[PDB]
Amino acid sequence: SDAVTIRTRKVISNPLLARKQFVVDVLHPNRANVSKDELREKLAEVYKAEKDAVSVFGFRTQFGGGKSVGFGLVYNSVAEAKKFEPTYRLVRYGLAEKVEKASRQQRKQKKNRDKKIFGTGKRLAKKVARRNAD
Template identity: 50%
Template sequence: MCYSLRYCKNLSTLLGNCEKIMADGVVTIRTRKVMTNRLLCRKQMVVDILHPNRASIPKTEICERLAKMYKSTPDVITAFGFRCHFGGGRSTGFALIYDTLDYLKKFEPKYRQQRVSALFLKGYYKRERMGRKQRKERKNRMKKVRGTKKAKVGTAQKKN
């Protein structure tokens, strides 16, 4: 295979080889340090992904593969903290597999619940927020009162 385009007489051969190399994206997922956490009703593990000739893998695909490996469903799996190693081809992250969706809702932080919701459950967890200016005004009104009256200031403004 020639490496310089200047000396290469058959450019289509060179480009054809590149496409074939990039196309075979075999992904291998390995888990280690697998621990069953009975207090939080989940399995937790470190996930190593080998993905040569391919960019990082989407979390949906990771969760689906882990669901097959551990005989579960993808909606009770949270995968996070993935980092690509220098040189590419390898990523390492963390995964939690909950026993049921109820335990996931009970123990998982809200921000990770929103991520799982965005990937698989399409809006089971929807957080309603006031506008930025309303939140700032409410915060400043709460500074002017003491004790339990702070909560009343907040709820009174929500009704308006």
């Protein structure tokens, strides 16, 4: 690009979650769409820790472009980053994968159906099979 000049503002240390909180102020003249995925490494070698210990979110472009403001988090190590960052933000970075699950409508069906059954239901399963024969 040209004059990316990533800047961090209002930096406050958060040792409660072993993290540094700061506002990612981006100046990108003649550029747009600063591609927060690329904000991770440029914020990594600034703090020198690693690329997978930094998370970026927010980044609403100002009126007319050429400037962006968002929020950034950098962790001491990836161990606490995986244990603190939300699961939704991790899958964006590729750290975790989508957990396969039926739609919210379908889960409600299964819970309601399973309420009609008392016990495991194996005894009922053979009983209806025995009854269905005759």
